[PDB]
Amino acid sequence: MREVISIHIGQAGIQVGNACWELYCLEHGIQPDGQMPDAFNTFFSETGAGKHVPRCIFLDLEPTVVDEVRTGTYRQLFHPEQLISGKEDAANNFARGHYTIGKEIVDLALDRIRKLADNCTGLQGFLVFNAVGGGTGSGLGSLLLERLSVDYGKKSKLGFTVYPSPQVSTAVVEPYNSVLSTHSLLEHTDVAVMLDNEAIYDICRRSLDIERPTYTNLNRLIAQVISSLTASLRFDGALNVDITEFQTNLVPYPRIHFMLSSYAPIISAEKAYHEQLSVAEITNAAFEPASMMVKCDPRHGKYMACCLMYRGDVVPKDVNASVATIKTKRTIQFVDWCPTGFKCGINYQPPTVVPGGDLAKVQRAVCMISNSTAIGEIFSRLDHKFDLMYAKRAFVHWYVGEGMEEGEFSEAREDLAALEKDFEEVGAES
Amino acid sequence: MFKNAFQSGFLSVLYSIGSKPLEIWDKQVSNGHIKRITDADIQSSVLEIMGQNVSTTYITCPADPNKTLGIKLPFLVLIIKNLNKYFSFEVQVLDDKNVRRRFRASNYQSTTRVKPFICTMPMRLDSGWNQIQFNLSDFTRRAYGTNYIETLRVQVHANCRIRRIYFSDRLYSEEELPAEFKLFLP
Amino acid sequence: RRNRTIAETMRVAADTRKLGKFEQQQAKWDEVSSTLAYRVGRAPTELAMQRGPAWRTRAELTELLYRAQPRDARGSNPDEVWTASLRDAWERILPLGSIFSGLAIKIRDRPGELPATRAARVGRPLDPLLAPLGGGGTTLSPATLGHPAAAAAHAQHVATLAANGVMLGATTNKPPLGRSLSARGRAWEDSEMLKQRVAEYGTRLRALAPHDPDFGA
Amino acid sequence: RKERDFHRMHHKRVAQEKNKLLTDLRRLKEHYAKYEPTILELKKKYETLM
Amino acid sequence: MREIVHIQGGQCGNQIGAKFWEVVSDEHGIDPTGTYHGDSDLQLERINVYFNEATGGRYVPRAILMDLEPGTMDSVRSGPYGQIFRPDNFVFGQTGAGNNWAKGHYTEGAELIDSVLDVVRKEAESCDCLQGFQVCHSLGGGTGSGMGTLLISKIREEYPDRMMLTFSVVPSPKVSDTVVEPYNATLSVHQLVENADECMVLDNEALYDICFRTLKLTTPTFGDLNHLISAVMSGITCCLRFPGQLNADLRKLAVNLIPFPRLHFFMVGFTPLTSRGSQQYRALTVPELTQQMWDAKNMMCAADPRHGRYLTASALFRGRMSTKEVDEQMLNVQNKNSSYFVEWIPNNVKSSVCDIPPKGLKMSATFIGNSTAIQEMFKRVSEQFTAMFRRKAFLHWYTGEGMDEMEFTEAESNMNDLVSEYQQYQDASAE
Amino acid sequence: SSGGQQLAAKDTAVKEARQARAVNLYSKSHSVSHNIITGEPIKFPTA
Numbered sequence A: 001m002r003e004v005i006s007i008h009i010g011q012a013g014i015q016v017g018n019a020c021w022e023l024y025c026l027e028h029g030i031q032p033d034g035q036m037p038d039a040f041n042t043f044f045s046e047t048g049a050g051k052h053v054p055r056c057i058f059l060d061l062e063p064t065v066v067d068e069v070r071t072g073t074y075r076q077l078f079h080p081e082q083l084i085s086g087k088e089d090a091a092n093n094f095a096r097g098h099y100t101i102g103k104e105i106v107d108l109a110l111d112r113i114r115k116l117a118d119n120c121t122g123l124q125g126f127l128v129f130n131a132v133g134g135g136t137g138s139g140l141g142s143l144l145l146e147r148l149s150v151d152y153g154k155k156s157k158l159g160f161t162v163y164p165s166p167q168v169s170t171a172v173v174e175p176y177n178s179v180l181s182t183h184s185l186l187e188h189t190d191v192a193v194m195l196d197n198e199a200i201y202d203i204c205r206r207s208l209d210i211e212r213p214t215y216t217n218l219n220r221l222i223a224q225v226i227s228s229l230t231a232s233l234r235f236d237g238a239l240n241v242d243i244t245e246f247q248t249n250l251v252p253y254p255r256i257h258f259m260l261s262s263y264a265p266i267i268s269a270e271k272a273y274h275e276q277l278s279v280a281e282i283t284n285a286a287f288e289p290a291s292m293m294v295k296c297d298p299r300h301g302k303y304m305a306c307c308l309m310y311r312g313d314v315v316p317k318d319v320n321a322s323v324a325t326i327k328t329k330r331t332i333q334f335v336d337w338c339p340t341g342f343k344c345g346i347n348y349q350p351p352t353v354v355p356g357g358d359l360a361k362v363q364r365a366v367c368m369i370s371n372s373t374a375i376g377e378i379f380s381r382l383d384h385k386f387d388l389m390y391a392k393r394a395f396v397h398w399y400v401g402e403g404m405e406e407g408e409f410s411e412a413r414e415d416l417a418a419l420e421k422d423f424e425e426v427g428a429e430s
Numbered sequence B: 001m002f003k004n005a006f007q008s009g010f011l012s013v014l015y016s017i018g019s020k021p022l023e024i025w026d027k028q029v030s031n032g033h034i035k036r037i038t039d040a041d042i043q044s045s046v047l048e049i050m051g052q053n054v055s056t057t058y059i060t061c062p063a064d065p066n067k068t069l070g071i072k073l074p075f076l077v078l079i080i081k082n083l084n085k086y087f088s089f090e091v092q093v094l095d096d097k098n099v100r101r102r103f104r105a106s107n108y109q110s111t112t113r114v115k116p117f118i119c120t121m122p123m124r125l126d127s128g129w130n131q132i133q134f135n136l137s138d139f140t141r142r143a144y145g146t147n148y149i150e151t152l153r154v155q156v157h158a159n160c161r162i163r164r165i166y167f168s169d170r171l172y173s174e175e176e177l178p179a180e181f182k183l184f185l186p
Numbered sequence C: 001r002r003n004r005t006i007a008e009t010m011r012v013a014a015d016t017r018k019l020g021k022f023e024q025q026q027a028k029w030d031e032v033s034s035t036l037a038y039r040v041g042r043a044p045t046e047l048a049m050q051r052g053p054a055w056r057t058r059a060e061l062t063e064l065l066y067r068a069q070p071r072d073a074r075g076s077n078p079d080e081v082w083t084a085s086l087r088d089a090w091e092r093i094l095p096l097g098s099i100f101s102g103l104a105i106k107i108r109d110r111p112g113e114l115p116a117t118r119a120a121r122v123g124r125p126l127d128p129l130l131a132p133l134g135g136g137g138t139t140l141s142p143a144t145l146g147h148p149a150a151a152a153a154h155a156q157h158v159a160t161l162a163a164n165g166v167m168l169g170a171t172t173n174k175p176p177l178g179r180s181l182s183a184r185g186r187a188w189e190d191s192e193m194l195k196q197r198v199a200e201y202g203t204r205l206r207a208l209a210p211h212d213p214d215f216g217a
Numbered sequence D: 001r002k003e004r005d006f007h008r009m010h011h012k013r014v015a016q017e018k019n020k021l022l023t024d025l026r027r028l029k030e031h032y033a034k035y036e037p038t039i040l041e042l043k044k045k046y047e048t049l050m
Numbered sequence E: 001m002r003e004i005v006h007i008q009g010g011q012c013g014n015q016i017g018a019k020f021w022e023v024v025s026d027e028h029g030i031d032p033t034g035t036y037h038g039d040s041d042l043q044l045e046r047i048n049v050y051f052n053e054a055t056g057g058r059y060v061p062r063a064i065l066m067d068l069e070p071g072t073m074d075s076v077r078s079g080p081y082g083q084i085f086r087p088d089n090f091v092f093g094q095t096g097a098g099n100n101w102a103k104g105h106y107t108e109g110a111e112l113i114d115s116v117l118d119v120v121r122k123e124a125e126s127c128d129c130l131q132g133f134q135v136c137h138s139l140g141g142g143t144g145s146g147m148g149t150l151l152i153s154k155i156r157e158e159y160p161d162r163m164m165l166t167f168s169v170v171p172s173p174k175v176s177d178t179v180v181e182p183y184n185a186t187l188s189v190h191q192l193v194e195n196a197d198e199c200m201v202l203d204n205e206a207l208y209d210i211c212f213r214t215l216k217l218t219t220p221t222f223g224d225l226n227h228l229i230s231a232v233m234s235g236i237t238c239c240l241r242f243p244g245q246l247n248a249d250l251r252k253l254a255v256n257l258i259p260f261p262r263l264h265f266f267m268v269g270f271t272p273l274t275s276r277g278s279q280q281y282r283a284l285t286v287p288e289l290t291q292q293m294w295d296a297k298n299m300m301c302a303a304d305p306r307h308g309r310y311l312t313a314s315a316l317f318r319g320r321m322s323t324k325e326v327d328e329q330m331l332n333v334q335n336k337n338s339s340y341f342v343e344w345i346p347n348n349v350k351s352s353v354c355d356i357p358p359k360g361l362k363m364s365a366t367f368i369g370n371s372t373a374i375q376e377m378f379k380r381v382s383e384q385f386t387a388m389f390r391r392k393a394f395l396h397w398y399t400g401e402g403m404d405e406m407e408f409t410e411a412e413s414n415m416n417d418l419v420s421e422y423q424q425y426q427d428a429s430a431e
Numbered sequence F: 001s002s003g004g005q006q007l008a009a010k011d012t013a014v015k016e017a018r019q020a021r022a023v024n025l026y027s028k029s030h031s032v033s034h035n036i037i038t039g040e041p042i043k044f045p046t047a
Ligand SMILES: Nc1nc2c(ncn2[C@@H]2O[C@H](COP(=O)(O)OP(=O)(O)OP(=O)(O)O)[C@@H](O)[C@H]2O)c(=O)[nH]1
Pocket: A009, A010, A011, A012, A013, A015, A016, A060, A061, A062, A089, A090, A091, A092, A093, A131, A132, A133, A134, A135, A136, A137, A138, A162, A163, A169, A170, A171, A197, A215, A216, A218, A219
C-alpha cells in the first residue's frame, strides 16, 4: 500500500508540520482526538480501535516547539514517543547539531524511523521538512539524511528546505549553516524542493491582500503545496502521479535535483467570486514568476523539466490546451536538449480549506514543481555572502570549538562552487 | 573427453582446412547457414556462420550435452574475420570449487556484467582478420577469486568466419609459432 | 576500403549500422564532453554528464546492503518475518480492499540471496574516463570503498597546506575552482557511515557477493 | 595601511585562537589529572595483593 | 471457437481496457454482475471469444491486468463493470516502475513477469483454439510500456504461431505528458517491430480533435477518449464474434495489411461520428460512412494521411448493408485520388462486412490504414531522442538499472531503419 | 449466530460503500449525459 513517512527537523520543521498536519486531518476527516467519524493509509496508520496516528516524527533539540504540540490541540493525535525532544538546542550552530549534540539524539531518531517503517507495508518515500539556515534544521538534518541514504536505499527522499533570502533573513549566521548543509542535501536527498521566506510573504501581501501576516499564515499554504504533490496517492484521478514519478522525470543529472514550487490559485474570500478560475488562467498564473515560492526569475534561466499537479474538475483537455499556449509564449524559455518538458498529473478532489484560513474554497488548483537553471542564482546570492563573512573568519570559533576543524569550511564553500558550476554547465547550449 | 589425449604445447580443437572440418563440433542453425567459403584476402577455405539472430544459431565443441571437454591450458586463441556484424562466443570453465562459470563475450554490449554464475563481456575488433587471445586463468582470476582448472564448453554463436581455434599454454608470437598455425605465412 | 528485394537489402546491412551508430555516438559524446568542459571550465571526468557509473555503483551498493542486512535492520514486522518463514517458501499475501473484491500482493523475498534478475554487478571497461578508477565498479571492501586515491591525495594536500600555515579563504577576489565530491573524496560512496556499515555487515556481504572484481582488464 | 591592517588582523586572530586552545588544553590537563592518584594507589594495592 | 486473450498493462492500458470491457459486456448483454441478460441469440453464439463461463452462468472476461502501482487497479476494480474481472487475474506489484523503461523491463518488472506469465499460460492452455493476444498499453510511460513489452517478447517465444494485436498510445506531438517520452517510445517500438505481429497506433491529440471538431464535446473527459478507442477495438474483432456476408478474422487482416514483415504499424478510425446537433440531419448510408472514413480528421493518429501513400487500407464494415455499395464506394475512393494510394499494389482496399451493427447504430465501420505517412510520427520521436540523447539527460535513471547504453543505440537504429523503409516504399515505382 | 448476522450486515455495508464509489467514478468519468457514439441515454449500470 502507498505509505509515506515524514520527518520534521528544527523549529521550522514542526511549525510547518503543525500547519501540514492540520490539513491532512480535515482531508480524511480525522479529528484532533484521532478518530474518524482506506484512502487515509498514506499519512495515517490505524491503531487498535478506530484511532489513527500520523506517520511522522517531530524531532528538535529545543524543547520549546515540541512541547507546544504536546500541550496544543493535537495532544491526542501524535504518539508521545514520536515527538522526540532534547535538552538544549543547537543554538544556530551547524557543528552543534552535527557533532556534539546531534550524535546522542540521532540514535533515538532511527529507533522510531525503523519502528515506523516496519509497521507500514510499502514505503513510497521520505518527506523532510527543515530549514537549512538554522542549527538543528541543518546540522541534525544533515546527520539524519546521511543515515537514511546509507540505511534505506532506493527509497526516494523529498526535500522541502526553507532557505535564506538575500533581501531579508532572521539570523546573522544564515550563510554558515546553509553552506555547510549543502554537502548533505546534494548527495543524500533525491529530490529537493526549495522554499524561501519573503518570496512567500509577497504571495500573502499581493495575492491574499493581507498586509501583516505571520509564520502561521506562511506555513498554511506551504501545506497546500505539500498536500497537492502527494494527493495522487490518497485519491483517485485521471493521471495517478506517484512519488517515484518526481525522481524519474524532474532530474536529468544526479546532483542537480533542485526544483521550485508554485501554487496557482492564491485568492481571498472576497476576490474569489469576481475572478473566474479558468484552467488557462491558473496555468498562466502558475508559470508567472510572481507565483513562485522562491525568488527566481525564470526569464533569466531556462526550464529543465516541469511537473504539473492538477486538482479538482480539470478535464484532460483543458490541461492540454492551456499548456500548449505555455510553450508558444516567448517569455517561457525551455532548455534546448529537453523538447518533452511537461509532466501532467490530474487528480479528482478539490483542495480542502481549514476553518479560519486565508485561502478560499476553489474548484481547481495547480501545484507546479519545476526544474530551472535560475535556481542556481539563489546559490550565487549565498556565495558572495559566505565569502565576505569567511574572509575575516567571523563567527567561526563557535564552529571550531564544537568538534569541527577550521578546514571543514573550505571544502563546504568549494562544494558550493561545484553546485554553481554545475548549473551554468547544464544551462549552456550545445 | 580430451583428458587422456593431452598434447604438450598447442592443442588444436578445430581447424577449417581438411577433408571434414566439422569432425567433433555439433551444429545448430535457425534462420541462418553454415558455409565453408574460401575468402578473398587469404584465398583459403574458412568456415562461416551466419544468422539473422545471434542466440539461435550456434556450434558447440562437445556434441552431446551431457559430455564435457577438458583442456588444462589457460589460453584460447581464435582466428576470426571481422564481418562488421554481431559476434558472440562463450566459454564455460570449471573452477577451484568445482563450479561452472560461463564467460560470454559479445559485440552488442559495451559494459561488462558479472552475475554469480555467468559473466558477460564486451568485444571490440579491428578491421579485417583477427586473432583473439582469451586468457582463461587471468579472466577467471579477475572475475572471481578462484583459479582455472579446465574448460568444459566452447561455443561461437555469431556471424563470423572461423578457422584455427585452439588452446595455448602461453602467448606465442609469429616467430615461435608452429608451421601450420600461421594463417599469414611471412 | 572499397536481384534482391529492398527489405532484404535493408535487413542484411542493418546490423552493420547497428554496430556503427554506437561508435558514432561515442565520438559525438567525446566531442560534446570536450566542448562543454572547455566552455564551463572543468575536467571532462568532472562534468555532470559523466555521473552515470557513480549512480550505478551507488544503486549496486544500496541493493547489496538491503539484501545483506540482518533481519532486524531489514524489518522486525511480526507478521512479515513469521508468515514468510512458515515454510521453505517465502511469500507473504498483502490484502488490498475489502474481503468482497480483494486483491493480493504476493511479496517474495528470500533473505541472504539477491534475486536472479537483480544479482548483477555492472561496470564499464571501455569508457576511458574511468581509467584512473581501474574500471568503475562496485567495491565491497572498506579500504577501496568509494574513491580512495583522490581522497588520500586531498588529505595529503590539506595536511601539507595546514603544516605550511597558508590561508586559503583570505581574499574574495579569487573564486574557488569547482571540483566535485568524487574529486575531493566526499561523494556518497566515500562516506564514513557506509564505511562503518559495510565493516559491520561485511561477513554476510561477502556471503552474498563472493569477490569484488577488478574491471580494468 | 589597509594591507598591513589585513595582516595584523590575521596575526591577532590566530594568536587569540592559539591562546584559547592552549587554555582548553590546560583545562583538560587539570580535569584528567585527578585520575592519576587513584590509579597509582589501585596499582599499589594490586602489587601488594599479588 | 476462435478466441483472444486480453492483456492490459500500465495506467493507460487499465483505464482504456476498463472502458473496452464496457462495450463488449454491453454488446454481448453481460450485466454489471456478470450474468447474461442479452435479448438476442446471436450475442450468445460466440461468447467464448472473450469470456469464460463460470458458476451461476455468469461470464468472467479473459483479461489479465498488470501494473506495478496498486493505485490503478483500485480504480478498475471499484469502478463500474469492475466486478466482472477475476481477482486472480489482478497480477500487480507494490514498488512502482514510475515512468522508467529500465525498471519495468529489466529490474522491477521482472519479478512480476514470472507471475503474470503464469496466469496468461493458465488462460491460454485452458481455452481450446487461440487466435492471439490483444494487448493494450502505452509508450510514453514506463510501467506499461516497460512491463508490457517484456511480456510481448516472452509470449512470442512460448507461442510463435499466434498474433499480437497491440493498441499502444504514442507521445503527443504538441504536448508531452511525461518528460521521458522519447526514451520510452523509441525503446519500446524497437521491442515491438520484431515481436508484435501487427500494431495499432493511437494518441491523445488526434482523439482531442475528433471530440471537438466532429462530436462537438468542448469538455471531453478521460473516458470519452477511451469510448472512441474501445469502439475501434470491438470493430477489429467484429467478424469473429458475429456472422456476416464477408467475414475477416485477425489473420485475414494481417495477411492483407502487412506487405513486408516490419511494416506493421497501423492508423485507425471509427466512421459514424456526429454531434447531437447534427444527428437528425445525417443520412447514414454507405456513401456517408465512406466519406467520413477516409477523411484525415477522422483518423486516431497524429500523422496526416495526405502526406504519404496508403500501402494497404482495410475497413471492417458492420450493419445490414449491400456489398455492392461497399464494393463501389471503395472502388471510387481509389480512383478519385490515386496519388494518395500506392501504385504497385493493385486493389489496396480490404473490404469485409458483418451483418450485426453495434447497439444503438444501424450502420458502422472500422478503418485500418497502413500509411507511410506514419513515418512522420517516428521521425518526431527520434528527433526528440537525439536532442535528449546527445547530453545524457535523464539517462542515468535508465543505466542505473543495469541497462547498457548499447540498447539506446540499438533502439533508434531500428527506429531509423523503420522510418527509412517507409520513405523508400513511398518513393518506389513500378515500371 | 449473531456474529454471522453481523458479518452479513458488514458485507452489506461494504456493498453500499462500493456502490457509492462506483457512482462517483462513473459520474466523473462520463462528461455529457448521453452516449458519445450512439443515440442512447446514459444510465448507471445496475443489475
Ligand atoms: N516557512 C517557515 N520558515 C520558518 C518558520 N519558522 C522559522 N522558519 C525559518 O527558520 C529560521 C529560524 O531558525 P530555525 O532553522 O527554525 O532554527 P532550528 O532549526 O530550530 O535550529 P536551532 O534553533 O539552532 O535549534 C528562520 O530564519 C526562518 O527562515 C515558519 O514558521 N515557516
